[PDB]
Design a protein around this ligand. Structure first.
Ligand SMILES: [Zn+2]
Lengths: 100, 64, 54, 191, 213
RNA sequence: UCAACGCCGGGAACCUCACCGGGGGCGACGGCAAGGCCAGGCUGAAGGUCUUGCCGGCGAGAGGAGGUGCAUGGCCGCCGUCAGCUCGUACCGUGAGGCGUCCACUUAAGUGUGGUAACGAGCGAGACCCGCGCCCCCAGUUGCCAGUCCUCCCCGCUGGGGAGGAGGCACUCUGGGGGGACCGCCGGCGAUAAGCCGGAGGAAGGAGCGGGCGACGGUAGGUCAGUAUGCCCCGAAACCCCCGGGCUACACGCGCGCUACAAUGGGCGGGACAAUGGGAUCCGACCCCGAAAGGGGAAGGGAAUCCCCUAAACCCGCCCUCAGUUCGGAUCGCGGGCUGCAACUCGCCCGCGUGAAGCUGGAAUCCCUAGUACCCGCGUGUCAUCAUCGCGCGGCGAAUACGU
């Protein structure tokens, strides 16, 4: 009877946006939500050598891509889904919803 | 080095030339006054300015 | 005649992976489905979203 | 899983951007944007002379997903506003000038004034190569303000690079512009 | 084997390792009194907290300093007893447990053989192994080998290093153990026997210094 | 030479490949059928080519891991994490040029306080960005289990100890937003200025700690063998494909390392204790085979849910007691396996045997100021298989100086 929402993004602006949206929805309406819950940030590190040749002292570039993760549970009302599915979902955010 | 730099010292002297008695000999009051009066977004610069102003006030008030 | 012109479909080895930008063979970043040489990755990383963060 | 096709998308976007930067050079290329609607791929192409893009557009629409494999692509063509603040198009403009046969001091000073007129706090152009004879040299023309080092360097400044191909060889053009809507940390304004 | 009342030892009073007191110990050199820490403790382990501060070593218990000296490999880049002592994989480097136990056994042996407090023994040994030296000074262009006095803290460092090196010497590639060697060194230096590396080098250093006065 | 030599991410079985031996393809554009194949033969093997027939109706451009890094672009190292490098107006000089940018004190710093033919500006330093450590607010799943309730099991002495599943977000942790440190207080030393050393208090004390971004310039420094490019050169070829060899060859001189020359130890059996990261024909718990390496099934997991994962050094007891040994472990024989189209040249693991130099090292020389150095193991990159390497992670944890 509860629906679970997973949010993933490289930017926190869109995340704050979507989460405040869902909070306003579930507060103006009568329906319960647990969260939002911050999951551990997932970072991808790629370390490579600068030089295109083999001469000179060796120096290394450390490149890092960060991914933030949020979780919510929304209680799965009918108006809930109808008013949640139609929200501005920018392109820098990935959303996945499932049932329990 | 604990050497306060150009704009720090200049802004202190200017905010002091103006609004003179709105500052006193306590770092906390001076800090919040600086925050009120200036458009600064970092705490380190604010605190250094406030400390320099405390020193200015001490020396002016009770000496040269 | 027309057969001795195309390469076999290797499954493993240095000769089974190219760089889609430069065409090199050897030193290819293999990490997370990416197929780019170190040079090309170091050139186009920010346009993919990587940063300093050091 | 996650990054397999996340990075797939990033890589293909970069490669298509490159193909287009190379095939839309006469028009003035400024960028790209992709959004896969449920109907198909929305493909926004910026430019400064949209007329050049337009049966060319048909050949693009087809070749794109004939070779790289998009699905249901349809292309839009916008026009950049204030193109004299984008270092990319300015670099390509100057390279095309030098290829036409104008002298480099003239071209550089012209571009500098034409950029600084329409609004800018600072500009820097660097030319490198065989400018005077068969031994190579480098020369810079600058004006105004810049932030060569630090984070604001990446955050605020626009940078561009291009290659001029003459009968003798390659000349490298580097451009860097600062916009007027900027401000630095120590640049305070006192109440 | 160790008996159980020694393998599982529980202290009740504040005492070095729970066994040996300090109130009956008395220093006599007025130069070294203020640098010989005799505070009542149970565990001499400071976890490297007093290194940054210049004179922070006067707050460390003598036993902890000795343990840290004993925690060594021997003699690299210099010869001691005639020869390099390089172990490099069978050394107790960054292993304070073993040095703790070595010092404990040595103290037990000392108590057994002397019927006194090993801390008093060690104190007298330091007093007798601390040298009161020469260096090179330029009075303008020209340089002379001169004789200069020494400070208490460097005296202590010297004495402790020399005791530990004497033990490492007498335990080198021989049937003797490190604890027995350390006990021998300490007793010898405390009763002023030339059998001791430390007393020997003290006398040699003062001898040379006397020349170049 | 520093700034070459575990460097070209260069751990090469085929490929990589650029080298050697031998084969087979290859004429965009332009004007004077091509090709597909049953059987047999040449051939390492091949409609590659010959017998057999049947079907089918000349110069350039491309390309080049070919030459030139002394024709270039872009990128990288070094001077150097150095504090330096320029401009306007005025003034001094016939002029090249000078001043400013100098003197005194002062900082990690052309960083600042005063004086002065200079007055004012600019780039760099700083400011800026990331992480560590302390406190507050918000949040409670896939993370946590203290206090609460119910079951179940065990011990000795009913007093203790464990396992579930309810139910909770107290604690830990996770991650967003805020606070906190400023020579601020007090002592001294300093021109009464800029500032220096110390004491408390405090999570933290003197740009708190550690990193990223490295100015104007120059080095004919390196890279055309990463891609791009001017000139020069190679068309049945230096172009494009397949087979086999080689880069793994060894009288020797060098750099960087691994293992040791033993008791500050070797072996056997018992007892403990992490973090970083990664994971679809991938990680693989759990069961069964096997002495070992390994084999057969297979839950779950797209990763706060499952897995890689009960690390070693350390502690306890027993044997060895200063010996070329129960140190050391190279070299060689027989056998058993994995990956892979293929393991001889030229892979990795397991068992039983074999048992070489080496007894602390001259002249000379390297790295290191604190959670640093020494010691110990692990992850990841490369990767079908292969780590004495690079990039990182935690465990145990000092000695000396606060100088010239
Ligand atoms: Zn590439």
């Amino acid at each position: 009877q509860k629906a679970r929402i997973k949010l993933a993004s490289t930017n926190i602006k869109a995340l704050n946006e979507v989460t405040d949206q869902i909070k306003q929805i579930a507060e103006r309406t009568g329906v319960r939500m647990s969260g939002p819950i911050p999951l551990p940030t997932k970072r991808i590190r790629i370390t490579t050598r600068k030089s295109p040749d083999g001469e000179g002292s060796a120096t290394f570039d450390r490149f890092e891509l960060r991914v933030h993760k949020r979780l919510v549970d929304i209680e799965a009302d009918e108006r809930a889904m109808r008013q949640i599915m139609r929200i501005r979902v920018p392109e820098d955010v990935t959303i996945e919803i499932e049932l329990i | 080095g604990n050497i306060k730099q150009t704009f720090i010292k200049r802004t202190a002297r200017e905010l002091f030339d103006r609004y003179p008695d709105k500052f006193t000999r306590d770092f906390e009051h001076n800090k919040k006054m600086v925050a009120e009066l200036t458009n600064v977004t970092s705490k380190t610069i604010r605190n250094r300015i406030a400390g320099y102003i405390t020193r200015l006030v001490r020396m002016k008030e009770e000496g040269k | 005649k027309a057969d001795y012109n195309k390469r076999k479909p290797r499954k493993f080895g240095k000769g089974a992976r190219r760089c889609m930008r430069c065409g090199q063979y050897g030193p290819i970043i293999r990490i997370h489905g990416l197929m780019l040489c170190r040079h090309c990755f170091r050139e186009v990383a920010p346009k993919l979203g990587f940063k300093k963060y050091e | 899983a996650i990054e397999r096709y996340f990075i797939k998308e990033g890589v293909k976007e970069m490669l298509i951007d490159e193909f287009l930067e190379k095939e839309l050079r006469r028009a003035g290329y400024g960028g790209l944007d992709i959004k896969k609607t449920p109907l198909g791929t929305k493909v926004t192409i910026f430019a400064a002379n949209p007329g050049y893009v337009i049966r060319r557009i048909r050949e693009l629409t087809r070749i794109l997903e004939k070779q790289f494999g998009l699905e249901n692509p349809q292309i839009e063509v916008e026009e950049i506003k204030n193109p004299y603040l984008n270092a990319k198009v300015q670099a390509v403009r100057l390279a095309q000038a030098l290829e036409r046969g104008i002298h480099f001091r003239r071209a550089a000073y012209s571009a500098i004034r034409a950029i600084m007129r329409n609004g800018a706090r600072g500009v820097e152009i660097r030319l490198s190569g065989k400018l005077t004879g068969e031994r190579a040299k480098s020369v810079r023309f600058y004006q105004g303000y810049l932030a060569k080092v630090g984070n604001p360097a990446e955050t605020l400044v626009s940078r561009g690079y291009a290659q001029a191909q003459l009968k003798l060889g390659v000349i490298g053009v580097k451009v860097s512009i600062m916009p007027p809507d900027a401000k630095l940390p120590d640049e305070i304004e006192i109440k | 084997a160790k008996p159980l009342t020694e393998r599982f030892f529980i202290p009740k009073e504040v005492k070095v390792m729970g066994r040996w007191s300090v109130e009956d110990v008395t220093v006599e050199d007025p130069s070294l009194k203020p640098y010989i820490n005799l505070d009542a403790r149970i565990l001499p382990h400071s976890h490297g907290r007093y290194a940054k501060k210049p004179f922070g070593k006067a707050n460390v218990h003598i036993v902890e300093r000795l343990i840290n000296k004993v925690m060594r490999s021997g003699a690299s880049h210099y010869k001691a007893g005639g020869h390099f002592m390089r172990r490099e994989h069978r050394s107790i480097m960054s292993k304070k447990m073993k040095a703790y136990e070595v010092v404990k056994e040595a103290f037990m042996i000392i108590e057994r053989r002397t019927k006194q407090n090993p801390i008093q023994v060690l104190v007298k040994a330091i007093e007798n192994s601390a040298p009161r030296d020469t260096t090179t000074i330029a009075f303008g262009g020209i340089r002379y080998h001169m004789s200069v006095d020494v400070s208490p803290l460097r005296r202590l460092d010297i004495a402790l290093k020399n005791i530990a090196l004497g033990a490492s010497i007498k335990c080198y590639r021989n049937k003797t153990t490190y604890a027995q060697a350390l006990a021998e060194e300490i007793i010898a230096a405390a009763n002023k026997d030339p059998k001791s590396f430390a007393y020997s080098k003290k006398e040699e250093i003062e001898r040379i210094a006397q020349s170049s006065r």
